[PDB]
Amino acid sequence: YANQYDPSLLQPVPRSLNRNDLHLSATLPFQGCDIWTLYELSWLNQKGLPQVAIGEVSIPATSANLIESKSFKLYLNSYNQTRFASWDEVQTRLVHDLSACAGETVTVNVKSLNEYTAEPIVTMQGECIDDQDIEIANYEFDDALLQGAAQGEEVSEVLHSHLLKSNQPDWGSVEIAYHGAKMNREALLRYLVSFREHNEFHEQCVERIFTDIMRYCQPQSLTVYARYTRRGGLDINPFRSSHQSAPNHNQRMARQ
Amino acid sequence: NQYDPSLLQPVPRSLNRNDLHLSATLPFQGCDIWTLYELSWLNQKGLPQVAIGEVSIPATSANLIESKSFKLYLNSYNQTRFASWDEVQTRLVHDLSACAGETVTVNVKSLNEYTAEPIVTMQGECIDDQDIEIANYEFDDALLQGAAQGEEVSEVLHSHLLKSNQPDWGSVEIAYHGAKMNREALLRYLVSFREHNEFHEQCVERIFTDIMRYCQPQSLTVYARYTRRGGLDINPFRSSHQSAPNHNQRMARQ
Amino acid sequence: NQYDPSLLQPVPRSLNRNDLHLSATLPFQGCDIWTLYELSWLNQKGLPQVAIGEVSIPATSANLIESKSFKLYLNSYNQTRFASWDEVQTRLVHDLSACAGETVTVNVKSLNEYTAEPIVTMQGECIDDQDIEIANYEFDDALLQGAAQGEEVSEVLHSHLLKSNQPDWGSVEIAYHGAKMNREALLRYLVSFREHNEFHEQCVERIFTDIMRYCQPQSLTVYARYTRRGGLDINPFRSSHQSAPNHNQRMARQ
Amino acid sequence: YANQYDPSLLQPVPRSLNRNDLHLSATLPFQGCDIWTLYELSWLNQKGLPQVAIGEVSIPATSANLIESKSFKLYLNSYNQTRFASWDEVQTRLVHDLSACAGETVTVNVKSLNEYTAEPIVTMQGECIDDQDIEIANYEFDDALLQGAAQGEEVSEVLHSHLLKSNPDWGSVEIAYHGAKMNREALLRYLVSFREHNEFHEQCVERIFTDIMRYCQPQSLTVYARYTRRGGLDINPFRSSHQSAPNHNQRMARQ
């Protein structure tokens, strides 16, 4: 007997636990959300016939807790052999359980597979910074790579990179939109690549990138948004901004 | 932490084929199409490169490649400098062909080859929307007994409800020429895999050979597309007459 | 009449590309996919063989192959004994590569490879169902002026209303990432080809370059599938980033 | 200016003209129909926007006339720049004009392209006879190849071949019969002997039917051929001693 519905499998992690290392002020310097895509969501209807869907979850960055991804997979797996009366019931339980875990109302949209037919694979906004003629040999984390990286003229720009890797490896693309002194692209790319051997949660990586850019580069406004490939059937896409609340859509990128 | 072909582990196709009562003379042709979503290495100067790999392994190869070993092998690229993308392709073809036992094709695609690519569904009629009760989940090939008693047709059917055992998940497309299949029988048969344990490639061959022995179509193609595990997916294709699928685009859950 | 490669007539791609104001370094990559519905020859013992040929000619080739000459060339096979299907596939690759000026890929498929293959449509949203009036039929690329003023999107659009000139007929799929396109403008633009004269390959390159210069998408793919003439069809694919379509399946009118 | 709707482009050909050469009885020894597929049907709606469809036409084998294929193509092309108020109108005109040409009511379906999505490519019923270990060097027509071809035990069977060529035109042919079992080598050599031979598809099917009836004398017989299109149109003649039509007009691999 596979284990059936079990909300106790969900594991909260307080966001303050990692934010402590970032030495943040009393107020959070960002707002935003963690958007998750649940590619494996499946359960049984009343009559025992399997149902399959994709879930799209948004957890506020102000929630007391994030949800540990493994535990989230195990919790979703507990639906697989459980009978539910309706799709509405499934969506309601996901909101209830994930909101209890996070400590703040979590948004959930349970979508049938046909909602995805002809949907696009997308890239990120702005210019890709990856095509550089530089040598890298040190992959150890080094925030000081951002020392003096913003010395250009005042600009609004959006940059992105597909070279984010952190630690089993996690793989992501990251979009950085800002208004401030123009950022040195070589410094930025070396800084991003220095995560390659570093071990932090995706949500934390994004908050670290945001806070390092804010402290070294002092833009007037900033958004950092990363989209990671799935682990265990789930992906996370942390969005952190000085002024925006969320990305426009949750459209997948090429490796997602 | 460096490139290491010894990480690849073959599994002989003969194990399950003997279990299906097959001759070494196969009743199908085809291939296993793999998508490698996490392919990454370093260029000549140490700057990371990322790509998606598209691999086709002939169904006649002695071995399939065990997926986790495939993951670990690919990870061994991550901190290795390679002279060019052509070098990477070359190594992949060499190593994967040696492991499978027959020449494997490999296409290493840059990520921008996927911009504005659409998600696809499968062809023909989805059979999943049936108001039926499933009273148990044991595998039962005899669900197909007498399932093909209709008039001679050529049609294509699909289901998104394939699962085996962590769970794996797939959609499957069945194109045939023969006596028309009972859609309820077919759906019950597919659902009965849920608590079955075998590899994706093996499941597809089981589906193919069961439909053959119970339904006796003149022509049959079975093509399944499974969600990834460990950053790679497998899409086994088995056909009476066709060597490869004429499309390879990702589905909603992939 | 025996096998005769001198029947093939090349047409240089440069003629129309110069007319489109293209540099020798192209703004697209891609290929022309041909389907040879009437391929037939004699085996060693004089017994007729029939097959469907699938040919891909790189868009970088110096020449395209003129369709009527391609038909005449294929007809020269009809009363010629060839030792095996591999011999036929070899001759085709050799002759078509020499004519195009670059290696052409050829698959010679038996007819039973198509049994129970489904007809396909194109992906994304069809733009044809518009309640608009067309007041004249002259080609006008300026119909695209200001046509891309929407928000940044990635989407796929298609139309079945492509016609050029005896008339030719096609459907066209346009996938792009850029400012959202006005569908009325796009449909008018495509309808304005109706009484225009150029080759399919040239039409597609004109569509690509007109969209690129009026709409300025970040990336663009244009893939047209035309109905056959003389037993063969042409399906030109042109893309910023992709080298080939990830499907090759016939549509309703093909 | 493209030439607009012109029903005078259609060219009738009396069926009796070719049937002469087959020396038939007073009454026809067969019934059936010619099913045509019109893959490039297109016209303009009342606002000038192009419309595209696939037509499916059935002409009774009893019609006084068949329709010459090139003329049929030219007639359909005359729709391309012509405005019509509705699809129903287009269907109505096609029935009227094609029926007047043929001399007997013709059925016409005008189908939107989406009615073809996921439709199958099909093969023919029964056994393919093409995989034989025989040498052929003479491609001249020879009906005498069927002399004594049906000696076997009494059987019902269906046979098909993809090797029909005549003038090049390309087809597959399905032969269902009840009678003394037919020699497959003789049948295939006979079909291959059309390879350098000039006759209309409808006539080829009638010649095959009448040659098999005379040399093999089955109790019942159907001959159905499906040819690849010429000029955007295909023709699929069906002739039978006891059946009226095939079940569907589904395309084969080369069609």
Ligand SMILES: Nc1nc2[nH]cnc2c(=O)[nH]1
């Ligand atoms: N939420 C969350 N859970 C994890 N468990 C392992 N890695 C992660 C991560 O990056 N984010």
Ligand SMILES: Nc1nc2[nH]cnc2c(=O)[nH]1
């Ligand atoms: N090739 C292969 N390897 C596996 N390892 C675990 N499951 C699978 C599978 O389905 N296929």
Ligand SMILES: Nc1nc2[nH]cnc2c(=O)[nH]1
């Ligand atoms: N290659 C080619 N040859 C032709 N001959 C006449 N039209 C065409 C065409 O569109 N393409």
Ligand SMILES: Nc1nc2[nH]cnc2c(=O)[nH]1
């Ligand atoms: N109806 C008809 N017309 C033709 N015109 C040229 N060939 C043919 C044919 O086989 N049938």
Ligand SMILES: [Mg+2]
């Ligand atoms: Mg995603």
Ligand SMILES: [Mg+2]
């Ligand atoms: Mg047809």
